[PDB]
Amino acid sequence: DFNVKKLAADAGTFLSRAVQFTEEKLGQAEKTELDAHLENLLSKAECTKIWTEKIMKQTEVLLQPNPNARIEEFVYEKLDRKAPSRINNPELLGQYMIDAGTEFGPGTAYGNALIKCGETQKRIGTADRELIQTSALNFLTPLRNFIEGDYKTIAKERKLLQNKRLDLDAAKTRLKEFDRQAEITRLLLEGISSTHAHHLRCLNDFVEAQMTYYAQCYQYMLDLQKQLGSFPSNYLSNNNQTSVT
């Protein structure tokens, strides 16, 4: 009983090639840091940058674990131009089930039953349609615009710091603009380090955006025991058959 995680690790190559299938996580970011006063600040900065970046991709497989439907989510547009709709699976469950309860027979308990169940799956499909938007606008869009916004400024200032530090070192070694560039870089690194009530703001709203789906569709799904309860109450008194209460 040792291959129980040996070949599970060997199939973990397939599980991490499904991670490599359309680029899911793949590592963390990097290890290399600055000189040892902005060591952990640049570490917190770049791990903050990729921690902002990777959970967008990982929440996109939460919204769409289909391969094609992950390509329809990423664009920020709310119009039809290059983004089709996801085939919602309880919609595809009620789309046949309404016509199946129709063509079953209207004068049975099943005509009063399966039409209600296919209506219930169709009303459940609206929850799967509205699940993919609040993460698209509170976790994909503002973190994406913080990636395509102020993170370019932090990367530009540290890229020019890594250019001007060697200029300062080659100036000060050859005896007989490090300061301003280091100041704007260290200001952006300390702004991403200390002044960081932005990622907890999206995370505390992300857990509530996950949370405000479940009890609503739950308390909708209690109503099918009220709607379908006619057959344990009046169809049990049929002279043809007595059945399950």
Next chain:
Amino acid sequence: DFNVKKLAADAGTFLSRAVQFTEEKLGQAEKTELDAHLENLLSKAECTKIWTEKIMKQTEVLLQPNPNARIEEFVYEKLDRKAPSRINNPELLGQYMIDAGTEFGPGTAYGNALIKCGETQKRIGTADRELIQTSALNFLTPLRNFIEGDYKTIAKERKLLQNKRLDLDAAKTRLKEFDRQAEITRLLLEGISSTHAHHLRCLNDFVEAQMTYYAQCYQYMLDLQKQLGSFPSNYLSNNNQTSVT
């Protein structure tokens, strides 16, 4: 604004070729029925047979909308012989978020925060693991064993009825075993027609098996506002920064 459903129908070929991708629904069953006393009874029988068959496939895309993970669900075995585990997507979220909250830094609010969030996604992943079993044993397995059980008897008796009806007609036309075969066939058709507290039994348990996921993971997800509420209560009194309540 008329192409708004014209090219939506033309992409409905792609949406129904994703139905044709690993065989999702594809029609209903058939139209052809018997002579006009077992017309609607054979209609209810064959539409009952395919109505038992198709929602198994449609609930399998509810359990797994991944293409590979639909192949790992169908077998009734619960061991490891020819069915690997599904890569659960909130497991893949808390599998890197725990090490990211570790390597972020332990002496911050984020060390007390993102470790809690990655723990929350890991405890949410157990719900996605337990979602795929009660439909596998109350909707896949008994409907599958009713397909591979008594439906073979109904199909065999109607197949021999369609053999012996022409024998009776060719016997009674040529002047100068229809009855027993028609009796067992009509008994199986009326047993699938009237005595049918089997599909409502799996449907009323199927809606509760859907239902008993949501409020449980909901009331787990209210506890992260209790666990993460330390930062709107004690970290707001920091002399470095006042932040969001």
Next chain:
Amino acid sequence: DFNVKKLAADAGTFLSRAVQFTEEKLGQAEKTELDAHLENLLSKAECTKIWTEKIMKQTEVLLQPNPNARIEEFVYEKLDRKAPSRINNPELLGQYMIDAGTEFGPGTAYGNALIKCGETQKRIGTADRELIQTSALNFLTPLRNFIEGDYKTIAKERKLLQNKRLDLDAAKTRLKEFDRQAEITRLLLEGISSTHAHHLRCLNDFVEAQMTYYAQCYQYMLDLQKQLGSFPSNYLSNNNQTSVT
């Protein structure tokens, strides 16, 4: 459901080419203003000029949404020389209906009914004839004569201000009549800015000129329930038929 305004925007090219069809609105006017003391005063002046101009054209499609009948309205003349009459559509509704109630039969309820209805449409057509005149003389004619009157003076004074400002600048730059022209221009701009109880005077009369059509033709149209009410009162007592009250 995203093409629901994507192809509505793509047909908005046809809706704005119907704006381009005989020149309906087309933009606002312009953006370019003077130096930053007569910036907003010239903005208010030119937007006032085009705001005087464009609602004349837009009220002309309110009076005549026919394409030919918009060409018959614009000229200020009240005589026949180059302006024919509009084919009024309730006149064209009563023109057949009077001869149709005549040739229907005089000895029926329909002879006492459809002649009354075709008379009602003919008396309704006088309201469509008188709708197109009070906007032609309170919104087309005085705003048009304020366009072809004092607006030429404002445009002439600002055109000579834009000529003499560069003359003042080229005079005062070359060391070793801006004032009078700027005074008459700034007087006309402040007269169109502050002293502007002219466009509210036509607008408050324009909304009443719209308003004094509706209740008059309404309270005419209540009289057809008095004139046509003979058939729910005396024709119901016919021995041939009892009918709708």
